[PDB]
């Protein structure tokens, strides 16, 4: 038993991290097959970031202007191209440690593991969620740009995030592996507004099911409710509205615990209106929304990967 | 910026996990060089666990009674021996992926990463602390026995924990890699009492320094205090006493923030007596003690590994 904010094993991703250097800037890149992916602002100086013209900046650069370090090995940049906000540095050698991989664009509320790297060397791993406003609340220092987020499906690594920058507010923004930013953010140093951050209701409900599975039952109550009545209370406390698709995803958890989804919603409603009263749920004094219904089932059943 | 409960990259450890099967029981083992380490109760049936005589049980077993799976490869048990509570199955092949490793016995309050495995396959990774009562609050399901905890020093993997069992209270107990249990626990299915669990004061203080580094300053106050006055308040709320060694370890954090250790203690005292008042510190409504002073510096400076 027990419940922990669990990350995927990062072994398959560590073997893909390289150090990319262009001019004076150095950051991380993802080396799959014979292509290296990295944020395009590796070609920028600190002055350029204020208002960069990436096309003009990239035209001044040639293949031999990029230095790619795979630990102690050299990769020769033979071709270079810009796809949206990422650079695709075609190298001469294909990564022998390339895993079965796949590029995906996740949706808000989905969770993934981040491998924070500096100078192409792994530093740590943690799990986090894509906020509804398309930001992530991560842990990134200077030079962490290029670090990637990923999920693992048995034997496939699904790359979903590449880190690009820290907003003036301390939150983090990035792109998919095709270079398309999550959210309305651009890769320049300017004041950018992130939308209102709401709580991921479906994730909170999955977390409450995990608590029941692990022995925490005090928040259960004899009340019930409807979807509409619950939503109207949810939006007052900045909670994502619940749809029928959300109720469907929670089905398996409902069947394992014998607690109807709508009965759990009524319990959540009372928690929002009256609070926690200094008590805890799975060791937390706040409601946690960084566990998807899929994360809960896999940790409470023992899913593995190869 | 930002702060996250960060685990070490687990790539170096994934290549050492194997599946060990003896009779009908199957659990995880650690394959370093030509030796496989695993909990000795792999030789027990569900009935044996109630009161096992490990010497007599092991004498009925021969080298060919143990089945070691390294994914799709076979390892031939040529020699077997029992060291305290772990079995050392000497195999014919040396693990080619053996990293620079080292066995260590950590002290209470120290943190490490756990790689939860099932049937010798990695499932997830998380960071946790050794409680003062020598338990850990982890996430383990049936068959997770043999999963190991570890730290990484640049290029050395320091193995410090092997999981053995879940107590009736839901907490977890294990041994070092020499087979010596942490705490007064034995490897049998009986009611075992874990001591009073106290909060790791030095870790809480490091966490408050991390908050100041990241912008949370509201808990700072114009008060001060002495070590004795603070300790006397700490023990009322079940907090480990603070020694001079603890003050010394926090020196670097004191110098980076310009806040004297004793001034931070006075802030912590007021937090214990008056509470949080519904506010948060680094996104938490409770005081966190699973970050050592070393964890904080390494995440706020960007330490990497190879
Ligand atoms: Zn950058
Ligand atoms: Zn066991």
Swiss-Prot record, chains A, B:
| Mutation effect (residue 132 to H) | In strain: Omicron/BA.1, Omicron/BA.2, Omicron/BA.2.12.1, Omicron/BA.2.75, Omicron/BA.4, Omicron/BA.5, Omicron/BQ.1.1, Omicron/XBB.1.5, Omicron/EG.5.1
Q: Which residues form a coiled coil?
A: none
Effect on the protein upon substituting residue 90 to R: In strain: Beta/B.1.351
Q: Which organism is it from?
A: Severe acute respiratory syndrome coronavirus 2
Q: What does this protein do?
A: Cleaves the C-terminus of replicase polyprotein at 11 sites. Recognizes substrates containing the core sequence [ILMVF]-Q-|-[SGACN]. Cleaves and inactivates human TRMT1, preventing tRNA guanine(26)-dimethylation of tRNAs. May cleave human NLRP1 in lung epithelial cells, thereby activating the NLRP1 inflammasome pathway. May cleave human GSDMD, triggering alternative GSDME-mediated epithelial cell death upon activation of the NLRP1 inflammasome, which may enhance the release interleukins 1B, 6, 16 and 18. Also able to bind an ADP-ribose-1''-phosphate (ADRP).
Q: What is catalysed by this protein? A: TSAVLQ-|-SGFRK-NH2 and SGVTFQ-|-GKFKK the two peptides corresponding to the two self-cleavage sites of the SARS 3C-like proteinase are the two most reactive peptide substrates. The enzyme exhibits a strong preference for substrates containing Gln at P1 position and Leu at P2 position
Active-site residues per Swiss-Prot or TrEMBL entry: 41 (for 3cl-pro activity), 145 (nucleophile)
Q: Its domain of life?
A: Viruses
Which effect does the record note for changing residue 49 to A? Does not affect ability to cleave and inactivate human TRMT1
User: What are the leading ranks of the lineage?
Assistant: Viruses, Riboviria, Orthornavirae, Pisuviricota, Pisoniviricetes
Peptidase C30 domain boundaries: 1-306
Specify the cross-link site (Glycyl lysine isopeptide (Lys-Gly) (interchain with G-Cter in ubiquitin)). 5, 90
Complex formation: 3CL-PRO exists as monomer and homodimer. Only the homodimer shows catalytic activity. Interacts with host FBXO22; this interaction promotes the proteasomal degradation of nsp5.
Subcellular location(s): the record lists: Host cytoplasm; Host Golgi apparatus; Host nucleus
Name listed for the protein in its UniProt record: 3C-like proteinase nsp5
**Which part of the complete protein is shown?**
3264 to 3569 of 7096
The UniProt activity regulation field reads: Inhibited by pyridone-containing alpha-ketoamides compounds 13a and 13b. In turn, alpha-ketoamide 13b (tert-butyl (1-((S)-1-(((S)-4-(benzylamino)-3,4-dioxo-1-((S)-2-oxopyrrolidin-3-yl)butan-2-yl)amino)-3-cyclopropyl-1-oxopropan-2-yl)-2-oxo-1,2-dihydropyridin-3-yl)carbamate) inhibits SARS-CoV-2 replication in human lung cells. Inhibited ex vivo by michael acceptor inhibitor N3. Inhibited ex vivo by compound 11a and 11b.
Regions of this protein lying in the Cytoplasmic compartment: 1-306
């Amino acid at each position: 038993s027990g419940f922990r904010k669990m990350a995927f094993p990062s072994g398959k991703v560590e073997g893909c991290m390289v150090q990319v250097t262009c001019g004076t800037t150095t950051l991380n890149g993802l080396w799959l097959d014979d292509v290296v992916y990295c944020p395009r602002h590796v070609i920028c100086t600190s002055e350029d970031m204020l208002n960069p013209n990436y096309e003009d900046l990239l035209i001044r650069k040639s293949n031999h202007n990029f230095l790619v370090q795979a630990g102690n090995v050299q990769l020769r940049v033979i071709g270079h191209s810009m796809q949206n906000c990422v650079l695709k540095l075609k190298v001469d050698t294909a990564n022998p440690k390339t895993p079965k991989y796949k590029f995906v664009r996740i949706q808000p509320g989905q969770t993934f593991s981040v491998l924070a790297c500096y100078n192409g060397s792994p530093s740590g791993v943690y799990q986090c969620a894509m906020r509804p406003n398309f930001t992530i609340k991560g842990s990134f220092l200077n030079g962490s740009c290029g670090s990637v987020g990923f999920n693992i499906d048995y034997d496939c690594v699904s790359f979903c995030y590449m880190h690009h920058m820290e907003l003036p507010t301390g939150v983090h923004a990035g792109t998919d592996l095709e270079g398309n930013f999550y959210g309305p953010f651009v890769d320049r140093q300017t004041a950018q507004a992130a939308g209102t951050d709401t709580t991921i209701t479906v994730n909170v409900l999955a977390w409450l099911y995990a608590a029941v599975i692990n022995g925490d039952r005090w928040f259960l109550n004899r009340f019930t409710t409807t979807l509409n009545d619950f939503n109207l209370v949810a939006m007052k406390y900045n909670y994502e509205p619940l749809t029928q698709d959300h109720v469907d995803i929670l089905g398996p958890l409902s069947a394992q615990t014998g607690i109807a989804v709508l009965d759990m919603c009524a319990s959540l409603k009372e928690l929002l209106q009256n609070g926690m009263n200094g008590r805890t749920i799975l060791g937390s004094a706040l409601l946690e929304d960084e566990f998807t219904p899929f994360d809960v089932v896999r940790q409470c059943s023992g899913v593995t990967f190869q």
